[PDB]
Amino acid sequence: MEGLNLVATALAVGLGAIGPGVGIGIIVSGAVQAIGRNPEIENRVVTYMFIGIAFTEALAIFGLVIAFLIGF
Amino acid sequence: MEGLNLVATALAVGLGAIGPGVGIGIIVSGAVQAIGRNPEIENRVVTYMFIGIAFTEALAIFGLVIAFLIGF
Amino acid sequence: MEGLNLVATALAVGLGAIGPGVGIGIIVSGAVQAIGRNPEIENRVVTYMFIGIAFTEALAIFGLVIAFLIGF
Amino acid sequence: MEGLNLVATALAVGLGAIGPGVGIGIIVSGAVQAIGRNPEIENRVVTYMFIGIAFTEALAIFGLVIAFLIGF
Amino acid sequence: MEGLNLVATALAVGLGAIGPGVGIGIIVSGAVQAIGRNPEIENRVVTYMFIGIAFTEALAIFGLVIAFLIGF
Amino acid sequence: MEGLNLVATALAVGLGAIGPGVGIGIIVSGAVQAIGRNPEIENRVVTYMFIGIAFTEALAIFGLVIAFLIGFG
Amino acid sequence: MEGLNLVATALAVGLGAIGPGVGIGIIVSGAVQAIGRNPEIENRVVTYMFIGIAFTEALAIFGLVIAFLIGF
Amino acid sequence: MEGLNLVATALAVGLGAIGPGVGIGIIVSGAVQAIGRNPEIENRVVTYMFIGIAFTEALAIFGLVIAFLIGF
Amino acid sequence: MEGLNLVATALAVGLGAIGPGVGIGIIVSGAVQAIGRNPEIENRVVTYMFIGIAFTEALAIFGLVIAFLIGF
Amino acid sequence: MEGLNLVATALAVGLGAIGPGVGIGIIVSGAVQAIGRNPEIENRVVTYMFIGIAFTEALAIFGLVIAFLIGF
Amino acid sequence: VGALIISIASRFFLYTGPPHVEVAAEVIFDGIPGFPITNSFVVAIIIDIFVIALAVAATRNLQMVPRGLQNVMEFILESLYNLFRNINAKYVATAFPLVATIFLFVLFGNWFGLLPGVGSIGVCIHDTCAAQGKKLVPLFRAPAADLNFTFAIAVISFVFIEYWGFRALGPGYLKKFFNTNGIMSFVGIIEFISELVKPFALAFRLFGNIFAGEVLLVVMAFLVPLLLPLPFYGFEVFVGFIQALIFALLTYAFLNIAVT
Amino acid sequence: PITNSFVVAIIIDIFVIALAVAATRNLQMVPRGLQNVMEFILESLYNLFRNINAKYVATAFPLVATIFLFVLFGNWFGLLPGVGSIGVCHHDTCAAQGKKLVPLFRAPAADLNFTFAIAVISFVFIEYWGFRALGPGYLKKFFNTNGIMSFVGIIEFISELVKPFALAFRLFGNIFAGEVLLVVMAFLVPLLLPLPFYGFEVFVGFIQALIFALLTYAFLNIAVT
Amino acid sequence: GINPTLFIAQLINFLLLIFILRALLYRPVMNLLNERTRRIEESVRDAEKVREQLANARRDYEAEIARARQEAAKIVAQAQERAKQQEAEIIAQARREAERLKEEARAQAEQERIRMLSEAKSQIADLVTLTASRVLGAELQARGHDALIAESL
Amino acid sequence: PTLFIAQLINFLLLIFILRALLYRPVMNLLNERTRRIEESVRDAEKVREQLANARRDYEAEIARARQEAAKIVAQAQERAKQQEAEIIAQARREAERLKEEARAQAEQERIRMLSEAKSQIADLVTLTASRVLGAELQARGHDALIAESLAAL
Amino acid sequence: PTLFIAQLINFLLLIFILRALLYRPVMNLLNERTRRIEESVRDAEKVREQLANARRDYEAEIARARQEAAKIVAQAQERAKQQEAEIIAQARREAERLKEEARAQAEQERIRMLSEAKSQIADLVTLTASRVLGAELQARGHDALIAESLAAL
Amino acid sequence: GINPTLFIAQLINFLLLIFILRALLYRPVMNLLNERTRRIEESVRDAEKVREQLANARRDYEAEIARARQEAAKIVAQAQERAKQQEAEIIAQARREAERLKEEARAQAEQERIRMLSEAKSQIADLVTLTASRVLGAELQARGHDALIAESLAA
Numbered sequence A, B, C, D, E, G, H, I, J: 001m002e003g004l005n006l007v008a009t010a011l012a013v014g015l016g017a018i019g020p021g022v023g024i025g026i027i028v029s030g031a032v033q034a035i036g037r038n039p040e041i042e043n044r045v046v047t048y049m050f051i052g053i054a055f056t057e058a059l060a061i062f063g064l065v066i067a068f069l070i071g072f
Numbered sequence F: 001m002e003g004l005n006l007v008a009t010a011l012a013v014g015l016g017a018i019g020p021g022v023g024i025g026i027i028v029s030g031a032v033q034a035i036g037r038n039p040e041i042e043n044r045v046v047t048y049m050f051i052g053i054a055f056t057e058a059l060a061i062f063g064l065v066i067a068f069l070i071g072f073g
Numbered sequence K: 001v002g003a004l005i006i007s008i009a010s011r012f013f014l015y016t017g018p019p020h021v022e023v024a025a026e027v028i029f030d031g032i033p034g035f036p037i038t039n040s041f042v043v044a045i046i047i048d049i050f051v052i053a054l055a056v057a058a059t060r061n062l063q064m065v066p067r068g069l070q071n072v073m074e075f076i077l078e079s080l081y082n083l084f085r086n087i088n089a090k091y092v093a094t095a096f097p098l099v100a101t102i103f104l105f106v107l108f109g110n111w112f113g114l115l116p117g118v119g120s121i122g123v124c125i126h127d128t129c130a131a132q133g134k135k136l137v138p139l140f141r142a143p144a145a146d147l148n149f150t151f152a153i154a155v156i157s158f159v160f161i162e163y164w165g166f167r168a169l170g171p172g173y174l175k176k177f178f179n180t181n182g183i184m185s186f187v188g189i190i191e192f193i194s195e196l197v198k199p200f201a202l203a204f205r206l207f208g209n210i211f212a213g214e215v216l217l218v219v220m221a222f223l224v225p226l227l228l229p230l231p232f233y234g235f236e237v238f239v240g241f242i243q244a245l246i247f248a249l250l251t252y253a254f255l256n257i258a259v260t
Numbered sequence L: 001p002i003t004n005s006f007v008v009a010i011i012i013d014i015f016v017i018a019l020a021v022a023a024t025r026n027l028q029m030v031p032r033g034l035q036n037v038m039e040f041i042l043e044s045l046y047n048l049f050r051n052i053n054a055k056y057v058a059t060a061f062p063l064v065a066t067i068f069l070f071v072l073f074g075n076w077f078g079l080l081p082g083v084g085s086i087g088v089c090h091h092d093t094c095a096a097q098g099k100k101l102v103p104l105f106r107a108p109a110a111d112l113n114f115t116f117a118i119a120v121i122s123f124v125f126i127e128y129w130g131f132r133a134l135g136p137g138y139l140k141k142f143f144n145t146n147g148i149m150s151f152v153g154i155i156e157f158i159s160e161l162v163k164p165f166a167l168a169f170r171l172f173g174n175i176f177a178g179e180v181l182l183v184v185m186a187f188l189v190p191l192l193l194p195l196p197f198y199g200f201e202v203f204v205g206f207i208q209a210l211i212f213a214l215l216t217y218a219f220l221n222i223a224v225t
Numbered sequence M: 001g002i003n004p005t006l007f008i009a010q011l012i013n014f015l016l017l018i019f020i021l022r023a024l025l026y027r028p029v030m031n032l033l034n035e036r037t038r039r040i041e042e043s044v045r046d047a048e049k050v051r052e053q054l055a056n057a058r059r060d061y062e063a064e065i066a067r068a069r070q071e072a073a074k075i076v077a078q079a080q081e082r083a084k085q086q087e088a089e090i091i092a093q094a095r096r097e098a099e100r101l102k103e104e105a106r107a108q109a110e111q112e113r114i115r116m117l118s119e120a121k122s123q124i125a126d127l128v129t130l131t132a133s134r135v136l137g138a139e140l141q142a143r144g145h146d147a148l149i150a151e152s153l
Numbered sequence N, O: 001p002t003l004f005i006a007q008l009i010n011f012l013l014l015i016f017i018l019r020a021l022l023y024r025p026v027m028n029l030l031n032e033r034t035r036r037i038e039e040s041v042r043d044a045e046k047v048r049e050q051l052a053n054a055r056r057d058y059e060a061e062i063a064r065a066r067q068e069a070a071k072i073v074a075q076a077q078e079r080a081k082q083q084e085a086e087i088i089a090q091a092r093r094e095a096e097r098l099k100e101e102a103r104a105q106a107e108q109e110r111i112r113m114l115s116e117a118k119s120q121i122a123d124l125v126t127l128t129a130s131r132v133l134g135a136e137l138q139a140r141g142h143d144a145l146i147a148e149s150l151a152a153l
Numbered sequence P: 001g002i003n004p005t006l007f008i009a010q011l012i013n014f015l016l017l018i019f020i021l022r023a024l025l026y027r028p029v030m031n032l033l034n035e036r037t038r039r040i041e042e043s044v045r046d047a048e049k050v051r052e053q054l055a056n057a058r059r060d061y062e063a064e065i066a067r068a069r070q071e072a073a074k075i076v077a078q079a080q081e082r083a084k085q086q087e088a089e090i091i092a093q094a095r096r097e098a099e100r101l102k103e104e105a106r107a108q109a110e111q112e113r114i115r116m117l118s119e120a121k122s123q124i125a126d127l128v129t130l131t132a133s134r135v136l137g138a139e140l141q142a143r144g145h146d147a148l149i150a151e152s153l154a155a
Helices: A004-015 A020-037 A039-071 B004-037 B039-070 C004-016 C019-037 C039-071 D004-037 D039-071 E004-015 E018-037 E045-071 F004-014 F019-037 F039-070 G004-037 G043-071 H004-014 H019-037 H039-070 I004-015 I018-037 I039-070 J004-015 J019-037 J042-071 K039-059 K069-085 K092-112 K147-166 K184-222 K230-259 L004-025 L034-052 L061-077 L114-130 L149-188 L195-224 M004-115 M119-127 M129-133 N002-019 N023-141 N144-152 O002-133 O144-152 P004-036 P039-089 P092-117 P120-125
Strands: none
Touching: A004 A039, A004 B004, A004 B039, A004 J004, A020 A039, A020 B004, A020 B039, A020 J019, A039 B039, A039 J004, A039 J019, A039 J042, A039 L034, A039 L149, A039 L195, B004 B039, B004 C004, B004 C019, B004 C039, B039 C039, B039 L149, B039 L195, C004 C039, C004 D004, C004 D039, C019 C039, C019 D004, C019 D039, C039 D039, D004 D039, D004 E004, D004 E018, D004 E045, D039 E045, D039 K184, E004 E018, E004 E045, E004 F004, E004 F039, E018 E045, E018 F019, E018 F039, E045 F039, E045 K184, E045 K230, F004 F039, F004 G004, F004 G043, F019 F039, F019 G004, F019 G043, F039 G043, F039 K184, F039 K230, G004 G043, G004 H004, G004 H019, G004 H039, G043 H039, G043 K184, G043 K230, H004 H039, H004 I004, H004 I039, H019 H039, H019 I018, H019 I039, H039 I039, I004 I039, I004 J004, I004 J042, I018 I039, I018 J019, I018 J042, I039 J042, J004 J042, J019 J042, J042 L149, K039 K069, K039 K092, K039 K147, K039 M004, K069 K092, K069 K230, K069 M004, K069 N023, K092 K147, K092 K184, K092 K230, K092 M004, K147 K184, K147 K230, K147 M004, K184 K230, K184 N002, K230 N002, L004 L034, L004 L061, L004 L114, L004 P004, L034 L061, L034 L195, L034 O002, L034 P004, L061 L114, L061 L149, L061 L195, L061 P004, L114 L149, L114 L195, L114 P004, L149 L195, L149 O002, L195 O002, M004 N023, M119 M129, M119 N023, M129 N023, O002 P004, O002 P039, O002 P092, P039 P092
């Protein structure tokens, strides 16, 4: 097949972002709601929201680099 | 082939938009619910709303970038 | 293949209408529930509902413009 | 191949109905919940449902356009 | 390609129902929960439940009709 | 692609049975929870559930018939 | 291109099992939560739980039998 | 095709485990939440959780055995 | 084709983690929420959580072994 | 032919990171909500949240490893 | 009882005896010049005469205290009356003769589809005529599996709802035909499209939900013919009853939503 | 040999050194100006790192402060005018005697070389100080400790191995994606179109610069504990 | 098999079914049902009428007895008023007869005053005894009185 | 075909299964419904006949009240006339006793006046005796014989 | 490049436009922090100057106490000399009462002695008159008074 | 690929940057610490300030009551002094003005009464006017012999 690397890198960079997007959304919504319930705990909540987001976002990042390893 | 670049670009855009749409929806819904429950922390949660949305939005932008690297 | 441009054009719109379709729904549902729980905060949640809808619709518009580019 | 336009139209309609269907479901569920919890806000809040639901349909309708254009 | 139109009809029917299937369920589940929460408001919430169901069913029947046209 | 009709009749039923399955699940969960919280209305709202269920199954049924219309013309 | 019946059977089984599994999971979760909320109304809950489980597993059996036909 | 049997086995194992990957999760989450809300209803929620888990693993095992037929 | 076994390994691994990935998340979230609502019920709940995590893990492992056969 | 290895790496990276992403998102959301309900339970919910994150990230990392082996 | 489940009776000519699939969409029985009588029309008559005979038996010598057929007829009719009054309490009297008879016809049509001999008997593996070159056109096909009957019911219901939506609330119908300002203008065209879809959706729903069930029963008779399709016989009884009741429910609900 | 990322790293080093020397030139109570901004930033970061763990907030603070002050300015250098346009030349404005118009100002985090340095130094940091006050129990796999506790104890180790890899990959990926998005949107319409993306890029750069230090300290906290 | 002819004929059959069922069950069965409901509400109204009738029967009986008592009281009042008039007349007659008796007693007193004419029979016959004859010895030697015997006063 | 035999077998098995699973609850529900409706109609007819009985009892009570009023007024008139006769008799006897008392008082006054007349006559004769004795003493009664009798002792 | 130059210029313009608004709240926050530091050093310096001034406060309080003590003991001396005058005035009033209530009573006793002496001398002269003046008449006949008494009778 | 030399150079540059930043920020950190965290000693100095404010005030109030009791003692002492001064002034001369005159008046009364009794002219003034007073109406016929008439006024 000719031109399969293009669809390969596109598929990687696309499929890698359909899950972590929902993960980041759920994390941020939960953190915001919890801050709403108890404003004084936000200093102990954000520090767990952000490290959550990274734990999610890195997965999507594992797409991008692979795409850059496929595209380039 | 002669048009695998087109399907690659389309697949990249669509799959990069599948996840972040739901992520932004969840983020905004949670933030608006938290504001409605407690209106005194609006600027406190909106700050965590946008900086969450970008975290989600960037992912879609990722895909868009790859699209503009494939179609072009 | 000869109709690969057609399937790409269709795929872009179809896959870009998946994410924002659920995102706008979640945003509107959350804003509506917040309105029902507290009618006094109407504008301060309508603005953020519209902002989130604008973000998701922006992703959908990126999908649509990619499909138009492939179509043209 | 030969009948690629047919599968293009199929993908357009199906993937344009995947997202907006859940969007309509979530919008109507949220509006219904708000009505049940607070009927007095109905005359306002249902409007915020409609000005939302059409927006979501504006995605699927887009797919329908690609349904007819490719078919034409 | 010696039967690609069959795949087109299958995709048009199959993909056009996985979205509305969840949407109708969400709509009626929200309606039932609101009915249980507030038994009095029934004759009016079902009016919006059914317009939401009608819109979602129209979205699915779009795919069904597109599949039938390919079959014709 | 001499056996592509088999893939077609597989996709016609497989796809289109995912959404209705989750829909039926959500319907039953919501109705069960509602009658658990408000037993006195159980005999009333179940009729609304049994409608919606079939609604969702309708779409799934639309998946099957086309499948049967794919493998037999 | 022989052997496509194999991927047809696999596709039918997988895509007909990915829906009913989540459906009966949600059904059992909702039923068990309602039972835990109050145990008095149990039989009139398990009845509808098993009705929904039978319906969703019937959908799964639809998929399984149409797959076995390709296997036959 | 010299390899389609392997792809069919992979599809039959992978697909058909998404449904029995979310269904079991939702079942166990609901069961433990009902346990936490009411610790004395342990047996009557655990039996139903195991019943639902077996119901979903029925579909999972059906997919696995069909994969084995595609393979063994 | 000749590289189709690689795609089989990828599909077996890739599709085998979509279900259990969400399931483990839902189970852990439910168990942790139950612990937060009632710390004293943690111990028992934890066991059921580890019962839930293992089950879905098997269906992930059921995919993994395929990659240890096809890939090997 | 000539590129299916790239498609395999892409599919492994992508599909192996859409379940774990949502799983991590839900785990962090539930853990943060439990933090907001009870702060003192933090030490007893961060542990299990990290255990679930480790499980889902292990699934994703196994997907990435399987992709990289195909890439090698 | 105990654990005597042996399932050896299930291992009786798993797939060698019954034919492979032998299904179709619609067929013609004819028998008279001009109108091409079908097997579905035969059942649509044998059910119509059955319903009329049941009505005559139930109303035969109406007694003050119900007994037997009169009792069950009263129970069914009053349950349907209450079910429809739960939605709308004004048009139950007018819409009842149509909606109740839709239920009572579709129910017996679906239940007749599970009678033995629906696919086995054909006046027209090897079976009887199937072995002969002449195709074994099956008699006694369920009327709800016909696309000429479900579409007839759908178009009758559509004419009824349009008639009673134009006879009430005035001939304006500005909610869907056309609107001047606001997003209601955009909502109206979608509402019109949904209303046009509605009879097609109803007919396709009924036809599919009965035809797929009949095909399932035949094909699961093809493989392991004995004692395995019992749960699905029960499931199809329930699905026939549902598709009978929900058709009536949806007709009346659409009528109510059109009036409002 | 050197690349065009190293020169921007060196100019960021010069900028950081100049800012620090200016802040420390006149040290007195009631700060006002650049020293006030630097003190406020440092104290806000100090509180942020105290929230996770107050035991090591005063120990690993300079490392994370340098990480933030370097990554933030490296990311911000990518959006400045002249970045990606100035060519050293060993269509392209350097079309005659074409050398691909090599950009002189390449963002420090837009490479695979510099970004891997912080990842490996953070890895050796968690491995070192994790083993400092834990002995063999730091990286203990707990073989069948609570019922085959080794299996979970094994799958967690590879996560620790890929955590620096994930951090470096995410930093490089977001920086490169921002740069390419800026270039693409510039090519599409040369004015007034990338306005929503210009401010998005700097916000993302700052956010990732902060989250790098936040994640490293979180890993250190979950390592020692 | 979507031929218009069979569809139209079947639709006509369904319309015939609808009409025969309306003329057979839907009219008579609902007639029986709402007739039963009318019977129920009529029985409720009949129970209300029963309690009202018992109450008003008791009230009417009490009122009739009270009116009978009132007319008996007025009858006895008239009788006793006539009695009072009669006894007043009779006591007036008694008083006038007592006055007449006093008058005839005065007449008897006047007749006694007439009877006072007893001077020659007794008074002159006894005053001679109430003289010196009463005095011891009764000599009356020139102690007589020729004229003072008949003088008296 | 064997398909017909299999269909007969599974249909009879399903019928047997439903007979032992669905016959009893639907039969119990039907029996409960018909028992409730027959109890309702029995209550309706009982209420109707009770209303008829209440009307009959109201008529009987009215007749009893009329008879009671008639006998009360009859006995009241009888008592009124009896009291009139009794008061007439007692008034007559009071008049007679008053007349007799007046007659007795008149007779007592007559006899007392006769006694008073006798006393007056005695006083008059004593006064005349004193006068005549004084006149005789002034004329002849001055004697030494009376002094001698006084001194005799 | 011209396109690159235009893109860079637009990016710089947008960056400056956003940075002005971002720094305005940042400027407000910096001013708030500066004011907080200013008050947190102002309270420290006023506390330190109060600590330094406490030494002078000791002496000021001691001097105020001692001058208040001097003035209040001066007031005490004034009260004491007032009490001196009050006591001496009471003593002098008592002396006046002594010289008045005794001398006047002495003269009253003297005049009572004079009165009793007058009564005594009157009694003495009466006794002398009865002694010798009475005997002055017994020599001179002492029969005139007896003759007068005899004549008076 | 990735050049190991570039990675080593980047790591060395990062280490040098970290060392330089730590050396430069050690002074600002120490300055901020001395400016902010030291104020705990300022708070305890406020505590000592209120302690010293109450301390000297306590002794001030003690002396304020000490002068009061001291003046009360002096006032009572001088009241006793005045009492003993006036009591001595109302006995020695009080008797001389009260009891000395009590018999001095009697002494002078005796001195005048003896003169009055020595007035034989008053003795002869009366005892002659008593003539012609209920007795001896004539002026004088006994020649007024003074053999015992002159003898009178024995006291």
